[PDB]
Amino acid sequence: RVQPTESIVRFPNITNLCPFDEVFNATRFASVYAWNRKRISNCVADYSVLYNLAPFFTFKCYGVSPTKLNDLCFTNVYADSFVIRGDEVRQIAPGQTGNIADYNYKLPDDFTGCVIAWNSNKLDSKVSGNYNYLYRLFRKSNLKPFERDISTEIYQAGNKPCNGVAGFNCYFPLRSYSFRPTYGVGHQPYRVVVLSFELLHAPATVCGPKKSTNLVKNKCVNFNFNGLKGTGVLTESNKKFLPFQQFGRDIADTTDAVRDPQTLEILDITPCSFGGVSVITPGTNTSNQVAVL
Amino acid sequence: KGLTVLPPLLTDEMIAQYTSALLAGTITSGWTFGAGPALQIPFPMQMAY
Amino acid sequence: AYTNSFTRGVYYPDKVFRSSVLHSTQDLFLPFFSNVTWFHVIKRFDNPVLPFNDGVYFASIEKSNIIRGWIFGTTLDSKTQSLLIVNNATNVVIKVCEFQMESEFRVYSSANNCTFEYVSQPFLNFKNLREFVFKNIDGYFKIYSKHTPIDLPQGFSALEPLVDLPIGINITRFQTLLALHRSGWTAGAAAYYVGYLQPRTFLLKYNENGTITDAVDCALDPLSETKCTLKSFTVEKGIYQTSNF
Amino acid sequence: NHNAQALNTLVKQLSSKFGAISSVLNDIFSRLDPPEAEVQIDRLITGRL
Ligand SMILES: *[C@@H]1O[C@H](CO)[C@@H](O)[C@H](O)[C@H]1NC(C)=O
Numbered sequence: 001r002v003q004p005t006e007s008i009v010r011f012p013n014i015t016n017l018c019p020f021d022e023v024f025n026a027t028r029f030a031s032v033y034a035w036n037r038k039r040i041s042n043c044v045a046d047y048s049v050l051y052n053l054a055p056f057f058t059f060k061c062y063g064v065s066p067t068k069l070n071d072l073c074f075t076n077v078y079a080d081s082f083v084i085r086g087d088e089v090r091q092i093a094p095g096q097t098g099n100i101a102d103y104n105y106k107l108p109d110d111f112t113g114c115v116i117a118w119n120s121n122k123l124d125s126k127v128s129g130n131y132n133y134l135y136r137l138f139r140k141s142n143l144k145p146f147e148r149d150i151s152t153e154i155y156q157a158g159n160k161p162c163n164g165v166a167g168f169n170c171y172f173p174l175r176s177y178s179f180r181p182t183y184g185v186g187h188q189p190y191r192v193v194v195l196s197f198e199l200l201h202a203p204a205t206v207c208g209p210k211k212s213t214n215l216v217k218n219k220c221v222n223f224n225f226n227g228l229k230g231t232g233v234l235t236e237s238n239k240k241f242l243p244f245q246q247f248g249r250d251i252a253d254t255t256d257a258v259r260d261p262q263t264l265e266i267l268d269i270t271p272c273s274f275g276g277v278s279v280i281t282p283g284t285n286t287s288n289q290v291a292v293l
Numbered sequence: 294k295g296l297t298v299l300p301p302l303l304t305d306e307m308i309a310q311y312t313s314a315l316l317a318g319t320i321t322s323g324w325t326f327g328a329g330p331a332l333q334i335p336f337p338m339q340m341a342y
Numbered sequence: 343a344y345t346n347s348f349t350r351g352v353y354y355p356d357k358v359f360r361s362s363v364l365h366s367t368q369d370l371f372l373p374f375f376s377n378v379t380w381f382h383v384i385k386r387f388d389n390p391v392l393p394f395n396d397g398v399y400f401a402s403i404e405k406s407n408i409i410r411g412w413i414f415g416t417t418l419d420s421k422t423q424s425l426l427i428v429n430n431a432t433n434v435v436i437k438v439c440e441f442q443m444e445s446e447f448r449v450y451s452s453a454n455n456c457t458f459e460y461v462s463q464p465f466l467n468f469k470n471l472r473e474f475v476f477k478n479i480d481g482y483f484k485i486y487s488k489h490t491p492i493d494l495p496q497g498f499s500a501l502e503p504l505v506d507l508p509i510g511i512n513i514t515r516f517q518t519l520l521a522l523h524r525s526g527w528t529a530g531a532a533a534y535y536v537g538y539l540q541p542r543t544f545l546l547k548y549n550e551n552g553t554i555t556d557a558v559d560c561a562l563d564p565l566s567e568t569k570c571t572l573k574s575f576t577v578e579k580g581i582y583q584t585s586n587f
Numbered sequence: 588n589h590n591a592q593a594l595n596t597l598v599k600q601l602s603s604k605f606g607a608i609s610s611v612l613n614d615i616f617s618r619l620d621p622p623e624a625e626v627q628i629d630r631l632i633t634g635r636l
């Protein structure tokens with residue numbers, strides 16, 4: 001049998017990727033209390049760009065390895081974007097207790113996701129200072145995991161009725177967050193986006209980009225065209241498939257032709273040459289010379 | 294699939310030559326070729342026998 | 343009203359290309375010569391909720407594209423997500439959401455949440471016949487369509503796959519969407535036929551180009567069973583053992 | 588015809604699962620762990636033999 005010289009993997013041109021870049025580079029990020037939610041589906045996700053960029057220094061991933069994130073397939077990916085101070089960045093972790101964590105964004109202990117935080121002092125800080133960002137400071141009970149509260153009702157800290165007026169014992173729950181360039185790194189604003197990965201009964205719609213290799217023809221090579229795995233010799237084929245049709249089979253039901261995903265050309269697959277070996281020999285007593293068929 | 298057809302040792306042309314030899318003997322030698330060396334006989338006399 | 347399916351409703355089961363071969367396939371197919379409910383819209387207007395069951399074959403004989411789209415949902419209410427397919431001249435919109443030239447489109451008042459959305463080039467005397475097969479298997483909704491220039495015509499056509507969508511929703515009922523045109527509203531004559539797919543075994547004849555040219559339903563009649571057993575459309579004279587009653 | 592029928596039957600029998608999860612050896616190996624893979628493969632081997 002002729003063993004396969006090389007292995008070639010062919011997959012369709014990468015397309016339809018969800019706008020991770022847009023959410024990461026969004027000009028304005030929502031306040032932590034009103035954290036935005038992004039739904040990712042029917043897309044191919046490449047995380048190489050996020051890792052490559054210098055600004056995204058923090059890439060802490062819990063429950064899954066970031067390197068194999070592309071390899072692993074997740075039905076739905078959820079992206080939430082909020083800006084928080086450096087001191088409280090630690091609080092956004094599984095099983096971590098903090099003011100931001102308890103009253104703004106809550107992560108369950110069993111959370112499979114990667115949290116991405118990048119310091120963005122220039123964008124979020126002004127010489128005058130930026131008071132647009134707000135954080136919840138007063139809440140009756142700790143927030144449940146992945147729960148968003150936007151209530152502006154005046155907090156009641158006293159027996160006397162609040163009356164809807166923020167008097168003594170009544171304080172507005174949201175507190176303005178102050179950012180300046182001169183402020184220390186801990187006080188300095190950090191943009192944080194956490195990606196949550198989940199698996200559902202419905203077929204996964206989000207998966208990492210599929211790698212491809214150069215086509216090899218007229219040689220015996222292992223082939224993986226669109227998930228069809230076989231060992232064969234690939235040749236140009238006269239036969240023309242219908243547009244929907246991807247691969248072809250003979251009467252025996254063995255695959256005989258495949259259409260390349262990247263280039264729509266039908267290629268015949270022929271099994272690598274194999275045959276029986278027969279030794280033609282005169283009697284051993286007469287001679288030891290042999291001929292092989 | 295590992296299933297192979299092995300060619301016959303005697304080719305069709307060779308079989309035809311054997312058949313031709315049998316026909317030639319029967320027409321010219323009658324039944325003698327079967328029982329021994331071919332013996333010439335006229336075909337009408339062979340039919341008479 | 344009811345009509346005869348004849349040989350219509352055959353679709354390509356898989357993407358595999360087969361040339362000059364006859365293949366037996368077990369799949370959900372419309373039974374040959376099955377009885378199909380017929381709805382006529384002109385004054386007559388028909389828009390009933392019809393159970394999806396395992397699968398549905400929809401054929402519309404229409405002029406001026408009065409037929410517009412289809413709604414598929416378990417309950418057809420905001421409580422449960424419902425697949426929506428609609429068609430306009432520019433494009434066709436496929437949307438999965440919780441749902442409770444003409445410038446008026448009133449398919450849904452509001453959408454609570456949308457799991458999935460899709461857009462594509464439009465799918466669409468009566469000179470046009472539109473054949474659509476709808477199935478939900480393994481969380482994938484499959485649409486197969488053939489358009490032929492023209493009861494249902496007695497001819498054989500194979501429905502090429504149009505799109506496969508990972509809706510991942512449970513569909514038990516479906517309702518057609520029809521367009522009312524104001525000259526209050528006058529509607530041109532429209533015919534839409536609904537049929538239900540059943541598990542069946544079919545022998546499919548493939549030409550050199552790979553198009554299906556003829557089909558046989560094994561269970562339809564005894565001769566068809568004989569053809570299925572022998573895997574040949576032509577049957578020679580004789581007695582053939584086909585099945586055990 | 589009889590020879591052709593027998594060869595065709597043998598090749599078609601290759602597709603038969605024989606009670607295994609899959610008829611493709613590679614798919615069985617990837618999907619299942621080695622002990623489970625062995626039992627399913629043994630079913631395929633027995634049927635093909
Ligand atoms: C961000 O901008 C850089 C600019 O060089 C670009 O290379 C990258 O693809 C963009 N997106 C992300 C997610 O890094």
Ligand SMILES: *[C@@H]1O[C@H](CO)[C@@H](O)[C@H](O)[C@H]1NC(C)=O
Binds near residue numbers: 013263
């Ligand atoms: C895929 O990309 C290549 C360029 O690398 C292009 O030549 C080819 O036409 C593309 N195929 C499809 C189906 O888009």
Ligand SMILES: *[C@@H]1O[C@H](CO)[C@@H](O)[C@H](O)[C@H]1NC(C)=O
Binds near residue numbers: 345346
């Ligand atoms: C279809 O059903 C109707 C009753 O609803 C019946 O009268 C008719 O004969 C049926 N047609 C066929 C072809 O079975």
Ligand SMILES: *[C@@H]1O[C@H](CO)[C@@H](O)[C@H](O)[C@H]1NC(C)=O
Binds near residue numbers: 435
């Ligand atoms: C068709 O529908 C889409 C989605 O609602 C819309 O964007 C497009 O403009 C419509 N085309 C028309 C109304 O011609």
Ligand SMILES: *[C@@H]1O[C@H](CO)[C@@H](O)[C@H](O)[C@H]1NC(C)=O
Binds near residue numbers: 440
């Ligand atoms: C769908 O919308 C309802 C109403 O706003 C909301 O309560 C529910 O959580 C949504 N479902 C999903 C899966 O987002």
Ligand SMILES: *[C@@H]1O[C@H](CO)[C@@H](O)[C@H](O)[C@H]1NC(C)=O
Binds near residue numbers: 416512513514
């Ligand atoms: C779909 O819902 C119906 C009830 O409306 C139920 O009987 C059926 O089992 C459901 N199917 C699936 C696949 O969940």
Ligand SMILES: *[C@@H]1O[C@H](CO)[C@@H](O)[C@H](O)[C@H]1NC(C)=O
Binds near residue numbers: 549550551
């Ligand atoms: C197949 O297509 C060829 C053209 O490529 C045509 O000559 C031939 O008649 C077609 N055969 C059938 C059965 O459609």
